Amino acid sequence: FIQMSVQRIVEDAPPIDLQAEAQHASGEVEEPPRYLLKFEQIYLSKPTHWERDGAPSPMMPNEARLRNLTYSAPLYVDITKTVIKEGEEQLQTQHQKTFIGKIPIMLRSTYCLLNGLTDRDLCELNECPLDPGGYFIINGSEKVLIA
Amino acid sequence: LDLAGPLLAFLFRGMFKNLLKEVRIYAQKFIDRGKDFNLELAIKTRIISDGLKYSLATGNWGDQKKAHQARAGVSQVLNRLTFASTLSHLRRLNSPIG
Amino acid sequence: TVPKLYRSVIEDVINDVRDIFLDDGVDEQVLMELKTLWENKLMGQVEEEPLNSEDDVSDEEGQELFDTENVVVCQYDKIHRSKNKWKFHLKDGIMNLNGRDYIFSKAIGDAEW
Amino acid sequence: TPASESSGIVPQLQNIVSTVNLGCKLDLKTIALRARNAEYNPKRFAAVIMRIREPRTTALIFSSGKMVCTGAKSEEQSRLAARKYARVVQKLGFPAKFLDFKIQNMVGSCDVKFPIRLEGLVLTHQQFSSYEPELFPGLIYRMIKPRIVLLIFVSGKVVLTGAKVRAEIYEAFENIYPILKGFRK
Amino acid sequence: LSTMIGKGTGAASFDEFGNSKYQNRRTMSSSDRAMMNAFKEITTMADRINLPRNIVDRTNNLFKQVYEQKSLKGRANDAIASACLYIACRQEGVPRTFKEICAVSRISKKEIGRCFKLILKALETSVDLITTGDFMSRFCSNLCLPKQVQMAATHIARKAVELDLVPGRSPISVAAAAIYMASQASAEKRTQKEIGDIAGVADVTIRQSYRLIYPRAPDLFPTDFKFDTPVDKLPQL
Amino acid sequence: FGVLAKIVNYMKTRHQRGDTHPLTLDEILDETQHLDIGLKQKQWLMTEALVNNPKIEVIDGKYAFKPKYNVRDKKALLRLLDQHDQRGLGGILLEDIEEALPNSQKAVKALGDQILFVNR
Amino acid sequence: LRRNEQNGAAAHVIAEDVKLLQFHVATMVDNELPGLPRAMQKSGRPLK
Amino acid sequence: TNYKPVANHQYNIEYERKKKEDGKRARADKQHVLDMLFSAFEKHQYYNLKDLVDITKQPVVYLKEILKEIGVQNVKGIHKNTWELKPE
Amino acid sequence: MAYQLYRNTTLGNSLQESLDELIQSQQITPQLALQVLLQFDKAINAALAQRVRNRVNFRGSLNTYRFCDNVWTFVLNDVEFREVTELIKVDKVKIVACD
Numbered sequence A: 001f002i003q004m005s006v007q008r009i010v011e012d013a014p015p016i017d018l019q020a021e022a023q024h025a026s027g028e029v030e031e032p033p034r035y036l037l038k039f040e041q042i043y044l045s046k047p048t049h050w051e052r053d054g055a056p057s058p059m060m061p062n063e064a065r066l067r068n069l070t071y072s073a074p075l076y077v078d079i080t081k082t083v084i085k086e087g088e089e090q091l092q093t094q095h096q097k098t099f100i101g102k103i104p105i106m107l108r109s110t111y112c113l114l115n116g117l118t119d120r121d122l123c124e125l126n127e128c129p130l131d132p133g134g135y136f137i138i139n140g141s142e143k144v145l146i147a
Numbered sequence B: 001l002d003l004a005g006p007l008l009a010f011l012f013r014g015m016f017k018n019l020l021k022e023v024r025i026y027a028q029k030f031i032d033r034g035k036d037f038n039l040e041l042a043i044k045t046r047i048i049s050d051g052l053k054y055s056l057a058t059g060n061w062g063d064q065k066k067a068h069q070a071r072a073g074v075s076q077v078l079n080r081l082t083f084a085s086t087l088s089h090l091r092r093l094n095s096p097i098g
Numbered sequence C: 001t002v003p004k005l006y007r008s009v010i011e012d013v014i015n016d017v018r019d020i021f022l023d024d025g026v027d028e029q030v031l032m033e034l035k036t037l038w039e040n041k042l043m044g045q046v047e048e049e050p051l052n053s054e055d056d057v058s059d060e061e062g063q064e065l066f067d068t069e070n071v072v073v074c075q076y077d078k079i080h081r082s083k084n085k086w087k088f089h090l091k092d093g094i095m096n097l098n099g100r101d102y103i104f105s106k107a108i109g110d111a112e113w
Numbered sequence D: 001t002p003a004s005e006s007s008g009i010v011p012q013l014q015n016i017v018s019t020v021n022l023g024c025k026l027d028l029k030t031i032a033l034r035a036r037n038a039e040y041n042p043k044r045f046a047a048v049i050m051r052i053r054e055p056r057t058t059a060l061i062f063s064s065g066k067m068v069c070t071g072a073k074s075e076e077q078s079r080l081a082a083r084k085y086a087r088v089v090q091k092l093g094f095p096a097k098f099l100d101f102k103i104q105n106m107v108g109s110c111d112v113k114f115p116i117r118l119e120g121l122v123l124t125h126q127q128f129s130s131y132e133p134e135l136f137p138g139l140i141y142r143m144i145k146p147r148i149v150l151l152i153f154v155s156g157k158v159v160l161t162g163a164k165v166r167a168e169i170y171e172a173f174e175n176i177y178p179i180l181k182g183f184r185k
Numbered sequence E: 001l002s003t004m005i006g007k008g009t010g011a012a013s014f015d016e017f018g019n020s021k022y023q024n025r026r027t028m029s030s031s032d033r034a035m036m037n038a039f040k041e042i043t044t045m046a047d048r049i050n051l052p053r054n055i056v057d058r059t060n061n062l063f064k065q066v067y068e069q070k071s072l073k074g075r076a077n078d079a080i081a082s083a084c085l086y087i088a089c090r091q092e093g094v095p096r097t098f099k100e101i102c103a104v105s106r107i108s109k110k111e112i113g114r115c116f117k118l119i120l121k122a123l124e125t126s127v128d129l130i131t132t133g134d135f136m137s138r139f140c141s142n143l144c145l146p147k148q149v150q151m152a153a154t155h156i157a158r159k160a161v162e163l164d165l166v167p168g169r170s171p172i173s174v175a176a177a178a179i180y181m182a183s184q185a186s187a188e189k190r191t192q193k194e195i196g197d198i199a200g201v202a203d204v205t206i207r208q209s210y211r212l213i214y215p216r217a218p219d220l221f222p223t224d225f226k227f228d229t230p231v232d233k234l235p236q237l
Numbered sequence F: 001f002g003v004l005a006k007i008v009n010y011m012k013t014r015h016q017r018g019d020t021h022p023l024t025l026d027e028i029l030d031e032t033q034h035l036d037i038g039l040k041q042k043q044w045l046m047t048e049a050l051v052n053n054p055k056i057e058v059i060d061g062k063y064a065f066k067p068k069y070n071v072r073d074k075k076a077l078l079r080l081l082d083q084h085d086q087r088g089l090g091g092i093l094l095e096d097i098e099e100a101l102p103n104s105q106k107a108v109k110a111l112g113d114q115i116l117f118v119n120r
Numbered sequence G: 001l002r003r004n005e006q007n008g009a010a011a012h013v014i015a016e017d018v019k020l021l022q023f024h025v026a027t028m029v030d031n032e033l034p035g036l037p038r039a040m041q042k043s044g045r046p047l048k
Numbered sequence H: 001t002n003y004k005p006v007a008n009h010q011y012n013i014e015y016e017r018k019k020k021e022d023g024k025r026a027r028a029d030k031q032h033v034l035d036m037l038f039s040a041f042e043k044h045q046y047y048n049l050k051d052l053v054d055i056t057k058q059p060v061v062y063l064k065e066i067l068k069e070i071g072v073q074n075v076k077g078i079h080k081n082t083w084e085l086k087p088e
Numbered sequence I: 001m002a003y004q005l006y007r008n009t010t011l012g013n014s015l016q017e018s019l020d021e022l023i024q025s026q027q028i029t030p031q032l033a034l035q036v037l038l039q040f041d042k043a044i045n046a047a048l049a050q051r052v053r054n055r056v057n058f059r060g061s062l063n064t065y066r067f068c069d070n071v072w073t074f075v076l077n078d079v080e081f082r083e084v085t086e087l088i089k090v091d092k093v094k095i096v097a098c099d
Helices: A005-011 A061-066 A119-124 B004-033 B045-058 B083-090 C002-024 C028-042 D028-034 D075-092 D118-124 D166-181 E030-048 E053-069 E077-091 E098-104 E109-122 E133-142 E147-163 E171-184 E192-199 E203-220 F002-017 F025-032 F039-052 F078-082 F093-099 F103-110 G002-006 G012-029 H009-018 H031-041 H049-056 H060-069 I010-024 I030-051
Strands: A016-019 A034-044 A048-050 A056-058 A072-082 A093-104 A136-138 A141-145 B075-077 C070-082 C085-097 C100-103 C106-112 D012-021 D048-052 D057-061 D066-070 D099-110 D139-142 D149-152 D158-163 F057-059 F062-064 H072-075 H081-084 I056-068 I071-082 I087-098
Touching: A005 A034, A005 B004, A016 B004, A034 B004, A056 E133, A061 A136, A072 B045, A093 A136, A093 B004, A093 B045, A136 B045, A141 B045, B004 B045, B045 B075, B045 E030, C002 C028, C002 C100, C002 I010, C002 I030, C028 I010, C085 I030, C085 I056, C085 I087, D012 D075, D028 D048, D028 D075, D028 I056, D048 D075, D057 D075, D066 D075, D075 D099, D099 D166, D118 D139, D149 D166, D158 D166, E030 E053, E030 E077, E030 E098, E053 E077, E053 E109, E077 E098, E077 E109, E098 E109, E133 E147, E133 E171, E133 E192, E147 E171, E147 E203, E171 E192, E171 E203, E192 E203, F002 F025, F002 F039, F002 F093, F002 H031, F025 F039, F093 F103, G002 G012, H031 H049, H049 H060, H049 H081, I010 I030
Parallel strands: C070 I087, C106 I056
Antiparallel strands: A016 A034, A034 A072, A048 A056, A072 A093, A136 A141, A141 B075, C070 C085, C085 C100, C085 C106, D012 D066, D012 D099, D048 D057, D057 D066, D099 D158, D139 D149, D149 D158, F057 F062, H072 H081, I056 I071, I071 I087
């Protein structure tokens, strides 16, 4: 779902364009400002929390349960804004890197930071090595999907 | 069998088309006025984040506007009574009926 | 260099009006006589009404009537003012200084009042 | 016993704001055309702007018949300047009248020559002070005696506005000067 | 009051020859329809800087009061909302810079600043006087600096205000320069433009403030600092 | 086009002032000193516009009843205000003011005869 | 609707107001109404 | 994610444009603006009020009073009001 | 069209006088003379904007000033026009500027 489907959906088919109703009641000389937006590469951090200070930090899935947070990670995307006005200029395009939302992480999958660690490290993080994972954590509760 | 992949994928697309509407409607409002555009301001991060967070938490389906009864109880609190219990719930399979 | 531009201008004006003269049916001899003429021409008081207690705060008018001093005709780009100190950002530009003629495309500029 | 611990240092007046009504309607474009020390732009603002060297001042003349005079460093000179402006209007051929002259605002300043404690001043006068070191560098103090607005800077310099008469400046300063000396570094 | 209505099964519900099953829904709260609209703007802004839900509720509380006074009706609603948010952040004892509020809002620094002062006068309430320590945490985090450097910076800021070496100077400038000094005496170097981009302050204002603090640099460091770059080799400009 | 609209407004004003006398387009051009409007435009105004305008009546070679359907008489339409059982279907404040003099004096007098005013 | 009549009650709007009134009183007594949509709570659930 | 620049650049650009030429047309004109307005009404039989202010680049209250003096108004069932200047 | 300003110039005035000669001799019509003046304006404006490249710096004291109809009007005294190839001092100057 993360490695293919999410990237596929934002790359797929929603390019959009917009154009004000210029030359209203009068006008002529030119061609009604227009703007095009398209979304590309997508990025997904390791799960993060933000203290009231605003300081971002590595979250640990146990901390998420005792404080009732939500074990999720922030999502970012490449966005472009693209002008080929009706004449005077076709280039003036700008690259951005933008935060769009927070996606819940299923525990010990390739994006849940616990996967890269061994038995001793998980035991040191106070998260049991023999837990199976594969379940979301939302608002302090472990939430599992039924097939 | 619909697993997390096809369910979230339907769900995320639901969230993304809606976000797409909020950028369009915002940019349309800007152009009506004109010359004062920004792009991070048009996007509502809450739309994606909360729309999925809501679905997983409650158990409901869709963004609530397009019903919810067709995929009731697809999400659950993981039972953990005994290690075999947890392991069994992660291996649960369900089958829709009247 | 600059009479050349004036010469240049003679070229543009003459060519650009030919068709106009044609439209009036005026012969090209008149156009050339115009050009030749032109070229030869180129070279304590409780009373709220009486205010005579303040006479003479104004000066000679007088400065403007003559305008015998050299003149400058141009365009402005930016005009700025700070206290009695003035700042001028100008563009385009024909100057006449004591009989001779000068030109500029941009002028920048400072004065006090 | 003196009024304060070190008396005054004569705060000096720096700017005066007054208005006057000419009593009749005028044609500002003609004025602009005639005048030599003026400017007019309908596309920018409605009033015509004039400035004289005497006491060095500037005036705002409305089509309604009201004018405003600013810049004088004394009330007599502002009355003087306004009379001079009325004079040039007469000299244009217009029926100018010196009516409804009134001082609207006065601005003053002075220095105390020592650094001061502002965090304390705002602490001890929370009700009045509104120190915003982020935005404007100095402390804004709103007196309610001769209802005056003060600007106090860390160097010790002080500016005052909202006054209608000089005494209100000396009084407002006479109130604030001991407190300020009392937070001397 | 009243509930909403919608849809309508699939049996009937006039639209007769028309295509509008039964009837469209109706509004009921126009007079307040912009207070709900304020809350829509407040949570959005809030998420761009990721504040805890409690601050947002506090903001709703500040806004409700200011609206209810109508003592500043006419000024931009989004400006009033944005200023409420700024106040709420100081009252929560977690100050933010105005520059940070412009980043998330569509209202400029001038209007938020006006509304801020006006709201405090009108609401008869005052925030605490902001300090340098309040921002030390957030910046070092965005600069991925280790805990030890962050703590040195806090100490440097504290000493700097204590010795009154740069009086009058905005707390953001002193904060930016303390962080710069710290990062420059550690392995974790950072450029002026990089810090400037994060704090929002121009890098030349940092450069001046650093030039102001350099004469006494040795005295400002904690005795626990490991000096990766010695003062005797500390960069200057 | 504009000129004709200015003529109509002038014509209303002149009727208000009292000059209900019949006149011609040529006379209005003269009095307004706008004869240099051009014979083509003059004619088009005369023999298309000011004939399709229902406000003027053409008599022989001249225009009558000037600004609109009116009977004028010194705005002293007392019988008209009476108008037996018909009672005038209803008079308008705007028409009486346009008629000649301001209404107020007449209305005040009319309030002490048999008339009533409604804000409609 | 009372203020509406009292004032300048048109016609189509009165017919609309009657139809809306007819619906609300019916749905209060019975919200099942096979041939009609159901009165709902803001959360989405059907009104009881 | 989003740097703070005290004001949006483009907003500042809006300010830069606004701070050069203003729609605050001074009307000690009346006649020439009107002479132009007749010319405009020669171009089409009817106009909308939003464009009518737009084509005249001027304050609405004096024009509205002008439309009150000589003109007329008509809702063509399009909610939005439309005006004519015909003295007929 | 344009600033019409260049009609006040010597260049502009010598044209009008030349045109006036032609009108007294009735070789042309006033309407024709005006159209020639319009084309001269366009040509001289184009010539200024496209051909001219030199610049000049200036200083001095302001005596009087005026602004109306988008036209600036000054009169400076004791002016010093300074260039990298020229230097010019003058006691008084009148300046009209449009845009």
